[PDB]
Amino acid sequence: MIIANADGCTPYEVARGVTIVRGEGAYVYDAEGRGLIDLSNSFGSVMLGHQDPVVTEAVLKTVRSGVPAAASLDLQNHLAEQIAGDLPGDQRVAFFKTGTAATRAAASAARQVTGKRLIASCGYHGYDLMWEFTPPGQPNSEDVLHCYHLPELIDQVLDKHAHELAAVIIAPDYIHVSPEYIADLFERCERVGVVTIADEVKHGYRLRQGASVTEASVVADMYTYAKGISNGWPLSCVAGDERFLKPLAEFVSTLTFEAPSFAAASATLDRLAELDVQAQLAIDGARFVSEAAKMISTRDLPIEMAGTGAAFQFVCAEEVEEVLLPHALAEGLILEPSDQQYPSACFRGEVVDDALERLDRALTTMAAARPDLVGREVTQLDRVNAAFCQMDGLPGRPDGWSLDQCVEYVTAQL
């Protein structure tokens, strides 16, 4: 009502008809005491699980100490060392409170160093007007051009503007395109001498202990993190070469160095390593996705599974998704719509079996409630729409599509 910015783009929208009051591990609990397996995890900000006991103990002890902001420089420096040590090369780290602040800061540093203004972008980099999507070839109000993960559109912007780009910022994604496809986007920009920013806000510390692009054989001038590093506490950063981080020396807020979020983040990174989280998720998520695909097949429902491990998606028509999501919720399974799912470290062992049993029940009630969906086919356009929702770009030019058709498609999505 009176909150202006509580519309969409908030997690748990599927549950807006129920009341969530508690979270613990892989589960959240509604007002009636029912437990729901959570595959939203605050849009992937909770990588360890709700109320992780080590993170919580670290936060509680920091709160009880009352230590004020910007006094625990030892802890702050230790966290910067943790982050920099997981990236190849020599990095400095500048801390922020949201992913949007980190990506705008990285863009601002590129502008300061290069003396140029134009930025090219693939993917979603946050809510700031500078990241507002406009059609290909049309700079937005803050002089950002959007290329929708297509190498042909990157090539077009580089052909016309390589000499005047401050930077290219790319949010990687690997559900609908390969690591090699993503690496190719970075390398096109590197070959013409343009600064690169790997926006790892979503995938940093989710797919491996560090930046996802590192395993794609990419190195970038600057990296931005947020969701993976702090288990739901507001902390983000830009990590990158000294030349780009020096312009961020005065990019400080009163509470940049409030202590509880630093305690949470340092504990989170340690716990991710101790519990082998990303490698175990690769195993447990792959089991979930494989078994989910089998259950879908035996029921002839029009859903395809895409991705694996820590990042997978139920690919289907919007009409089908609008049935799957409530049926899953009725069986105690929270899914995010129009996006990947975001399992946490607690999505292991018996929890995966529990989630599959709930999905099994949901697919059965869905087939019985909506028998007209049984036998429906998943179309190319279904898959493209699902990819565009998840990665905010096209998964390469779809088969049989001209580049002009790609441009008209993305224009129609805005």
Ligand X SMILES: Cc1ncc(COP(=O)(O)O)c(CN)c1O
Strands (E), 200-339: 222-225, 236-240, 304-308, 311-315, 333-334
Question: Which of 94, 107, 201, 303: binder of ligand X (CB under 6 A)?
Answer: 201
Phi, psi of 36 (to 5 degrees): -125, 130
Question: Which of 98, 134, 140, 365: binder of ligand X (CB under 6 A)?
Answer: 98
Among residues 314, 323, 317, the alpha carbon closest in space to that of 382 is found at 317
Site map 65..104 versus ligand 827, x via CB under 6 A: ----------------------------------------
- Residue 321 is a binding residue for ligand 827 (CB under 6 A): no
Paired residues of 379 in beta bridges: none
How do 92-96 and 27-30 pair as beta strands?
Answer: unpaired
Question: Which of 27, 124, 262, 288: binder of ligand 827 (CB under 6 A)?
Answer: 124
Please say which residue, 250 or 404, places its beta carbon nearer to ligand 827.
250
Number of C-beta neighbours around residue 88 at 10 A: 9
Residue nearest to ligand 827 (CB): 133
- Residue 368 is a binding residue for a second copy (CB under 8 A): no
Q: Cβ(23)–Cβ(38) under 8 Å?
A: yes
- Residue 226 is a binding residue for ligand X (CB under 6 A): yes
Task: Name 260's Cβ contacts closer than 8 Å, sequence gap at least 6.
Answer: 59, 62, 63, 233
Please say which residue, 321 or 392, places its beta carbon nearer to ligand 827.
392
Among residues 155, 133, 136, the alpha carbon closest in space to that of 414 is found at 133
Shortest distance in whole angstroms from residue 353 CB to ligand X: 30
- Residue 255 is a binding residue for ligand 827 (CB under 6 A): no
Paired residues of 28 in beta bridges: 23, 36
- Residue 405 is a binding residue for ligand X (CB under 6 A): no
Among residues 354, 374, 352, 353, the alpha carbon closest in space to that of 363 is found at 374
Length of the chain: 414
- Residue 253 is a binding residue for ligand X (CB under 6 A): yes
- Residue 73 is a binding residue for a second copy (CB under 8 A): yes
Shortest distance in whole angstroms from residue 36 CB to Cl ion: 30
Cα distance from N-terminal residue to C-terminal residue, the chain: 26
SS3 call for 267: helix
| Residue 332 one-letter amino acid | G
Cα separation, 20 vs 10, in Å, equals 14
- Residue 316 is a binding residue for ligand X (CB under 6 A): no
- Residue 390 is a binding residue for ligand 827 (CB under 6 A): yes
Please say which residue, 48 or 101, places its beta carbon nearer to Cl ion.
101
Buried b (16+ CB within 10 A) or exposed e, 146-182: bbbbbbebbebbbeebbeebbbbbbbbbbbbbebebb
290 binds, among ligand X, ligand 827, Cl ion, none (CB under 5 to 8 A by kind): none
Paired residues of 341 in beta bridges: 312
60 binds, among ligand 827, a second copy, Cl ion, none (CB under 5 to 8 A by kind): a second copy
Question: Which of 27, 124, 262, 288: binder of ligand X (CB under 6 A)?
Answer: 124
Q: Cβ(156)–Cβ(122) under 8 Å?
A: no
- Residue 62 is a binding residue for a second copy (CB under 8 A): no
225 binds, among ligand X, Cl ion, a second copy, none (CB under 5 to 8 A by kind): none
199 binds, among ligand 827, a second copy, ligand X, none (CB under 5 to 8 A by kind): ligand X
- Residue 108 is a binding residue for ligand X (CB under 6 A): no
Shortest distance in whole angstroms from residue 88 CB to ligand 827: 26
Catalog residues that contact ligand X under the rule CB under 6 A.
98-100, 103, 123-126, 171, 199, 201-202, 226-227, 253-254
Catalog residues that contact ligand 827 under the rule CB under 6 A.
8-9, 43, 124, 133, 202, 250, 254, 339-340, 390, 392, 413-414
Catalog residues that contact Cl ion under the rule CB under 5 A.
97-98, 101
